[PDB]
Design a binder for this molecule. Structure first.
Ligand SMILES: *[C@@H]1O[C@H](CO)[C@@H](O[C@@H]2O[C@H](CO)[C@@H](O[C@@H]3O[C@H](CO[C@H]4O[C@H](CO)[C@@H](O)[C@H](O[C@H]5O[C@H](CO)[C@@H](O)[C@H](O)[C@@H]5O)[C@@H]4O)[C@@H](O)[C@H](O[C@H]4O[C@H](CO)[C@@H](O)[C@H](O)[C@@H]4O)[C@@H]3O)[C@H](O)[C@H]2NC(C)=O)[C@H](O)[C@H]1NC(C)=O
Ligand SMILES: *[C@@H]1O[C@H](CO)[C@@H](O[C@@H]2O[C@H](CO)[C@@H](O[C@@H]3O[C@H](CO[C@H]4O[C@H](CO)[C@@H](O)[C@H](O)[C@@H]4O)[C@@H](O)[C@H](O[C@H]4O[C@H](CO)[C@@H](O)[C@H](O)[C@@H]4O)[C@@H]3O)[C@H](O)[C@H]2NC(C)=O)[C@H](O)[C@H]1NC(C)=O
Ligand SMILES: *[C@@H]1O[C@H](CO)[C@@H](O[C@@H]2O[C@H](CO)[C@@H](O[C@@H]3O[C@H](CO)[C@@H](O)[C@H](O[C@H]4O[C@H](CO)[C@@H](O)[C@H](O)[C@@H]4O)[C@@H]3O)[C@H](O)[C@H]2NC(C)=O)[C@H](O)[C@H]1NC(C)=O
Ligand SMILES: *[C@@H]1O[C@H](CO)[C@@H](O[C@@H]2O[C@H](CO)[C@@H](O[C@@H]3O[C@H](CO[C@H]4O[C@H](CO)[C@@H](O)[C@H](O)[C@@H]4O)[C@@H](O)[C@H](O)[C@@H]3O)[C@H](O)[C@H]2NC(C)=O)[C@H](O)[C@H]1NC(C)=O
Ligand SMILES: *[C@@H]1O[C@H](CO)[C@@H](O[C@@H]2O[C@H](CO)[C@@H](O)[C@H](O)[C@H]2NC(C)=O)[C@H](O)[C@H]1NC(C)=O
Ligand SMILES: *[C@@H]1O[C@H](CO)[C@@H](O[C@@H]2O[C@H](CO)[C@@H](O)[C@H](O)[C@H]2NC(C)=O)[C@H](O)[C@H]1NC(C)=O
Ligand SMILES: *[C@@H]1O[C@H](CO)[C@@H](O[C@@H]2O[C@H](CO)[C@@H](O)[C@H](O)[C@H]2NC(C)=O)[C@H](O)[C@H]1NC(C)=O
Ligand SMILES: *[C@@H]1O[C@H](CO)[C@@H](O[C@@H]2O[C@H](CO)[C@@H](O)[C@H](O)[C@H]2NC(C)=O)[C@H](O)[C@H]1NC(C)=O
Ligand SMILES: *[C@@H]1O[C@H](CO)[C@@H](O[C@@H]2O[C@H](CO)[C@@H](O)[C@H](O)[C@H]2NC(C)=O)[C@H](O)[C@H]1NC(C)=O
Ligand SMILES: *[C@@H]1O[C@H](CO)[C@@H](O)[C@H](O)[C@H]1NC(C)=O
Ligand SMILES: *[C@@H]1O[C@H](CO)[C@@H](O)[C@H](O)[C@H]1NC(C)=O
Ligand SMILES: *[C@@H]1O[C@H](CO)[C@@H](O)[C@H](O)[C@H]1NC(C)=O
Ligand SMILES: *[C@@H]1O[C@H](CO)[C@@H](O)[C@H](O)[C@H]1NC(C)=O
Ligand SMILES: *[C@@H]1O[C@H](CO)[C@@H](O)[C@H](O)[C@H]1NC(C)=O
Ligand SMILES: *[C@@H]1O[C@H](CO)[C@@H](O)[C@H](O)[C@H]1NC(C)=O
Ligand SMILES: *[C@@H]1O[C@H](CO)[C@@H](O)[C@H](O)[C@H]1NC(C)=O
Ligand SMILES: *[C@@H]1O[C@H](CO)[C@@H](O)[C@H](O)[C@H]1NC(C)=O
Ligand SMILES: *[C@@H]1O[C@H](CO)[C@@H](O)[C@H](O)[C@H]1NC(C)=O
Ligand SMILES: *[C@@H]1O[C@H](CO)[C@@H](O)[C@H](O)[C@H]1NC(C)=O
Lengths: 128, 124, 427, 124, 124, 48
């Protein structure tokens, strides 16, 4: 029930790496996963992976396991149920195929069988 | 299970905290002795109020107790999964604080209009 | 859908509340009457409340508002049996002590055990306990209130006191090692009782208290408001050594059937000056630690000046405390004299007629022998003026208990919860 | 129904007053604090006596509770209609004041000779 | 039966004393008033502890109450006949004093893992 | 009506010297003594 603002639209060139931010608010940042999704010009949507701001646990697709650098900070608690967190996204071997819009996605629930499901999305960032 | 202790699941989901109820049920019950005897009496008073409420509801003896009062959407129009697997009991107490007296009366007569129905059942 | 309400008993939900806490102690008798507190449990359960974040405020906290009255109520309770020094309010004939004219040598006619026999007896009184008439002196309290001599069997020793919540309530600790007084503590744990709080009556310098982990914190409420005392809490202790070097004698004066006023006999040996010591090196590095966190609120460029008290009462102008049963009043001007082997010495005076807080006063009986006590100064109570200067203060005594009860907060359990599910009872 | 309140049906027929029981069930539970703390303790004492009696009768949790002890005509040879639709509970308490201790013992062993019968039932 | 009274069967066999339970269940509940008001409060406190334990066991309202926790032979490897027709309750309390806390926890979750099983039963 | 219930077959271990009823009564008496003299006149002027 809160925002997930991201960084700007930074465009570099192949071989390099790009860092993307994801600043949260309005919810306990530790209580839900942070998924990373992208929609490129060449395919459709592709799930990259999620990370648990609480367990520090990472789970990512084998197509992006050896490329993605995925980290999170620690929430600055605002109230009893509000905080301010941040998740970060980097990639390794960059090409023009990876050009697309990227967003972060907070998980759906805190328990059950749809705990990590990308529910609350960011705004989008335009890559190279 | 993990013996989280007293108020162990205070920040957990309501479904997780509902499994650990007897832990919070156990730990619920000279001039300075006058201040100590005061707290001793208030302890049984605040405890018997919860039991008197549970008694006139038919829940006397239950940690988890089901009823006939159906859930009004005015109280909370949230889905079942977004409650027991999302909010904590501390969060749920703020969302239902207003309507918490409305339900306590619905439970009171849903019990009197149950033992009255059972009195006519055993009258033959 | 098919959702009915179902009653849940024993749910983890609490509310901010105020209730009468009770005290607990471990192992003659002291003023704090800690023998009467229930035996502390050797197993202090600390349950960690995972995922929980609670809002503390050590300045709205009521545990310090209750303890501050438990102490005053223990003070007045511990003087009910003790002898009342109302016949000592007689005209005193005082001379100095041969020798700089501090403590006096006074002789006076005094009631005996027989109501028709008088006795010409003498005793010593520090000048801070007497005043003149026009040499003839009188005790300082005689125009304000009578004084009750402390029973020479009760001890002024602070004992670790544990505050506990009654059944149906709880105490929440804040395990945040960089937690300024207010805000939302992210790491919270519930305790049945607090830790051992020593009710050390102090001034300006918080003695024997609990240190801070990691770094030296500072608190206060509205730090931009200068009329709000700044509670600073050290991370490392600075050693302080105090002593009353004069070897004093105690003299019982039978002033009635069972009424015996313990007077000050004479000075055996050398007359010397009571004082305190602090390592100028350790006080330098500690004052350096305090000015560090002072810039985080006032600026990396502004100068931070330290000065002595602004004036007023004797108990606020000087580091006043208790050392072996006698109340010191140490001039701290040699400690707060900075703009940002060793031994800094504070000249201390000694009083016997103290009022404390308010009213009614107490005559502390003279302690026999040579007095010296070793303490850790662990906190501080500053006061900005309003190019920023800081001075020592201590307007209220409850800031002392507040420097120890900031970690805690009282909450009451409301174990009844109603929530929907697809459960209905039968017919 | 009409919310008559606390003791609202004190002068009504016993059948009318029996419908409004949870109203009287709710409202049933320094030197002057010593007199106030005294009344606070006696309040829980007089309340737990009714619950202890209800507990050893099998009525623990009931506002209306049926039993097996049959009505002796010696207690009151009045017809059912001339009781629930005529007398008030204040009148009925005077007519049964004497035999009120006789029934309290009949309920006590009709419960012990019921849980004893249930213990042999679940023994196979 | 013979009205042995309060603690009448204290030296009798456990089977004989178990028939006379409501007798011990009845009789279970200025500066000197401070000492009298003290004993009055402790009386309700020690009584509500037994009821709170009985409540979180499902035995709320029972003098004799059966459970699902099976008897561990580690507690007492004695036969049924050499217990109810031989030992007294005072003897049995010494033989089970150690394991008396182990059983109190087994009863607590055998009740929570019973009302949890009943909550899923009434969910359809 | 002082009820005395006979505990048949019962044997109990007494010890009148560890008994606490006498340790409580012995203080109830001393506390009654000091309590009964609070209002009464104090003979301090007789010490002449
Ligand atoms: C405090 O608050 C936090 C945040 O809200 C709570 O953390 C969340 O807990 C829930 C349930 O407890 C989690 O949902 C579960 O997710 C697991 C997925 O884990 C599996 O895969 C992971 C990556 O592959 C892996 O980490 C796991 O492996 C173990 O090792 C890691 C090492 O870091 C360890 O940390 C893990 O705990 C694992 O033990 C594991 O392989 C999923 O499997 C769960 O589904 C099962 O269980 C549910 C019922 O819970 C059931 O319905 C399913 O069918 C299935 O059987 C479940 O969805 C969530 O991921 C956590 N993190 C969040 C939300 O960010 C924490 O529990 C709270 N604690 C307290 C005390 O309040
Ligand atoms: C505070 O003030 C009080 C007074 O109010 C002081 O108390 C007095 O102290 C003085 C000493 O400074 C005492 O005087 C001494 O008395 C001794 C007792 O002897 C008396 O009795 C014998 C009988 O056995 C007589 O024969 C004798 O004359 C005395 O009357 C004497 O032994 C002392 O004599 C010394 O002085 C003389 C003359 O100088 C010498 O020749 C002697 O050799 C000897 O050295 C002396 O006279 C006096 O008694 C005390 N009074 C009371 C009531 O106790 C406190 O000392 C003072 N305290 C402080 C800290 O200042
Ligand atoms: C402060 O002043 C007081 C006096 O006002 C002073 O107390 C004195 O202490 C000494 C001990 O150093 C006492 O002397 C002893 O007295 C007893 C009888 O009372 C004797 O049995 C002793 O005999 C032997 O004991 C010594 C060991 O203590 C041996 O080393 C020695 O060989 C002795 O033969 C001894 O004489 C004296 O009695 C007291 N005086 C009073 C009035 O109590 C105290 O020491 C001073 N303190 C300081 C820090 O200056
Ligand atoms: C801050 O805390 C300090 C530590 O608790 C306090 O120091 C204590 O001060 C008191 C009184 O000033 C001392 O009590 C005195 O004890 C000595 C005799 O003690 C010696 O002998 C015993 C043998 O039983 C031995 O155990 C001791 O260690 C000593 O060797 C006498 O002069 C008196 O009887 C008096 O009771 C404490 O001993 C002393 N403790 C320590 C560890 O030094 C200090 O007072 C506190 N300050 C404030 C302001 O509260
Ligand atoms: C203690 O820290 C908290 C935050 O960790 C501070 O709270 C902020 O206070 C300012 C006012 O000075 C408010 O404008 C902010 O909204 C507060 N933030 C939060 C998250 O509540 C608090 O001021 C600090 N205490 C002191 C004495 O400086
Ligand atoms: C004790 O000593 C002080 C200081 O030696 C004396 O103080 C003097 O008091 C007189 C009053 O008669 C003043 O005129 C002097 O100016 C004071 N001197 C100083 C240096 O302050 C005091 O009088 C002495 N007391 C007795 C009783 O002799
Ligand atoms: C009791 O007497 C003291 C004398 O010390 C009074 O205090 C002084 O009062 C004068 C004014 O009359 C001031 O100039 C002094 O500064 C005061 N000194 C101290 C140490 O307080 C006190 O006011 C008197 N109290 C009453 C109630 O009469
Ligand atoms: C004064 O100094 C230190 C404060 O850290 C205390 O001495 C240490 O106490 C801790 C806690 O028990 C021990 O782990 C250390 O081993 C102690 N160090 C030494 C050198 O003894 C001391 O108790 C403090 N005194 C107070 C607070 O009164
Ligand atoms: C305060 O007093 C204590 C004790 O007298 C001093 O600690 C002593 O320090 C010396 C020198 O380092 C050691 O040889 C002693 O063993 C210490 N004594 C004890 C009991 O530990 C301390 O240095 C003094 N501090 C100040 C500031 O005066
Ligand atoms: C819900 O509650 C309102 C009063 O707040 C009531 O008017 C309405 O009839 C209720 N609806 C249901 C379905 O119970
Ligand atoms: C409860 O009532 C107050 C009345 O001001 C209202 O502000 C609040 O929103 C209500 N709570 C809910 C959950 O609607
Ligand atoms: C005691 O009273 C007498 C009465 O004559 C007087 O002379 C003497 O000075 C008094 N003593 C003191 C110490 O005031
Ligand atoms: C602090 O005090 C100043 C005036 O000294 C005032 O302007 C300011 O609003 C106060 N801040 C808070 C948070 O109360
Ligand atoms: C404070 O210092 C000034 C000058 O250093 C001095 O005149 C004054 O007496 C001092 N006051 C106190 C209470 O130390
Ligand atoms: C404290 O000491 C300073 C100098 O060390 C002195 O100027 C000041 O007057 C003293 N304060 C008091 C109250 O005596
Ligand atoms: C009625 O009570 C009397 C004792 O008052 C008893 O003797 C009689 O048997 C009882 N009759 C019935 C039918 O219960
Ligand atoms: C109850 O007993 C008294 C004894 O005097 C008797 O007068 C009264 O009539 C009895 N009550 C009834 C209802 O019979
Ligand atoms: C009996 O208790 C022991 C622990 O004292 C336990 O290990 C064992 O499994 C239990 N056996 C049975 C049959 O319950
Ligand atoms: C209970 O434990 C104690 C521990 O010393 C042991 O001596 C005793 O035999 C135990 N009781 C039983 C019945 O085994």
């Amino acid at each position: 029930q809160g925002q997930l603002v991201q960084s700007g639209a930074t465009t570099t060139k192949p071989g390099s790496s790009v860092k993307i931010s994801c600043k949260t608010s309005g919810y306990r940042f530790n209580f839900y996963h942070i998924n990373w999704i992208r929609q490129t010009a060449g395919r459709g949507p592709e799930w990259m992976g999620w990370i648990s701001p609480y367990s520090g646990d990472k789970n990512l697709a084998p197509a992006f396991q050896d490329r993605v650098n995925m980290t999170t900070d620690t929430e600055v608690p605002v109230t009893s149920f509000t905080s301010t967190g941040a998740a970060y996204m980097e990639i390794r071997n960059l090409t023009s195929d990876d050009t697309g819009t990227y967003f972060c996605a907070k998980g759906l629930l805190r328990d059950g069988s749809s705990t990590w499901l990308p529910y609350l999305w960011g705004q989008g960032t335009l890559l190279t | 299970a993990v013996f989280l202790g007293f108020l162990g699941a205070a920040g957990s989901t309501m479904g997780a905290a509902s499994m650990t109820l007897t832990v919070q049920a156990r730990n619920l019950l000279t001039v300075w002795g006058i201040k100590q005897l005061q707290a001793r009496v208030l302890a049984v008073e605040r405890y018997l109020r919860d039991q008197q409420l549970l008694g006139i509801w038919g829940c006397s003896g239950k940690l988890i107790c089901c009823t006939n009062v159906p859930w009004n959407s005015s109280w909370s129009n949230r889905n079942l999964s977004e409650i027991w697997d999302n909010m904590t009991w501390l969060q749920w107490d703020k969302e239902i604080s207003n309507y918490t007296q409305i339900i306590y009366g619905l439970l009171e007569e849903s019990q009197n209009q149950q033992e009255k129905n059972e009195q006519d059942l055993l009258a033959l | 859908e098919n959702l009915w309400v179902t009653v849940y008993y024993g749910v983890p939900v609490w509310k901010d509340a105020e209730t009468t806490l009770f005290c607990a102690s471990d192992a003659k008798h002291n003023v704090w009457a800690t023998h009467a507190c229930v035996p502390t449990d050797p197993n202090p359960q600390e349950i960690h409340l995972e995922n929980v974040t609670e809002e503390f405020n050590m300045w709205k906290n009521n545990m310090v508002e209750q303890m501050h009255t438990d102490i005053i109520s223990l003070w007045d309770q511990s003087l009910k049996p003790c002898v009342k020094l109302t016949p000592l309010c007689v005209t005193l004939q005082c001379t100095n002590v041969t020798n700089r004219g501090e403590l006096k040598n006074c002789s006076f006619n005094m009631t005996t055990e027989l109501r028709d026999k008088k006795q010409k007896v003498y005793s010593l009184f520090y000048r801070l306990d007497v005043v003149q008439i026009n040499k003839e002196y009188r005790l300082i309290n005689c125009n304000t209130s009578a004084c009750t001599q402390a029973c020479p069997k009760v001890s002024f020793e602070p004992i670790p006191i544990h505050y506990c919540a009654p059944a149906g309530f709880a105490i929440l600790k804040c395990k945040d090692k960089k937690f300024n007084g207010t805000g939302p503590c992210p790491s919270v744990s519930t305790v049945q009782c607090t830790h051992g709080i020593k009710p050390v009556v102090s001034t300006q310098l918080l003695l024997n208290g609990s240190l801070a982990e990691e770094e030296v914190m500072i608190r206060s409420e509205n730090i931009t408001n200068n009329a709000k005392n700044i509670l600073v809490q050290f991370n490392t202790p600075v050693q302080i050594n105090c002593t009353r070097p004069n070897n004093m004698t105690r003299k019982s004066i039978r002033i009635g059937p069972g009424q015996a006023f313990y007077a000050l006999g004479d000075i055996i040996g050398d007359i010397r000056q009571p004082h305190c010591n602090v390592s100028k090196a350790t006080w330098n590095e500690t004052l350096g630690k305090v000015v560090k966190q002072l810039r985080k609120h006032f600026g990396n460029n502004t100068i931070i000046r330290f000065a002595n008290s602004s004036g007023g009462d004797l108990e606020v102008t000087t580091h006043s405390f208790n050392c072996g049963g006698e109340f010191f009043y140490c001039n701290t001007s040699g400690l707060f004299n900075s703009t940002w082997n060793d031994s800094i010495t504070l000249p201390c005076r000694i009083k016997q007629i103290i009022n404390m807080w308010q009213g009614q006063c107490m005559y502390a009986p003279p302690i026999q022998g040579v007095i010296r006590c070793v303490s850790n100064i662990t906190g501080l109570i500053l006061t900005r003026d309003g190019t920023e200067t800081f001075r020592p203060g201590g307007g209220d005594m409850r800031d002392n208990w507040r420097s120890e009860l900031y970690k805690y907060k009282v909450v009451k359990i409301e174990p009844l919860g109603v929530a929907p599910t697809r459960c209905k009872r039968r017919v």
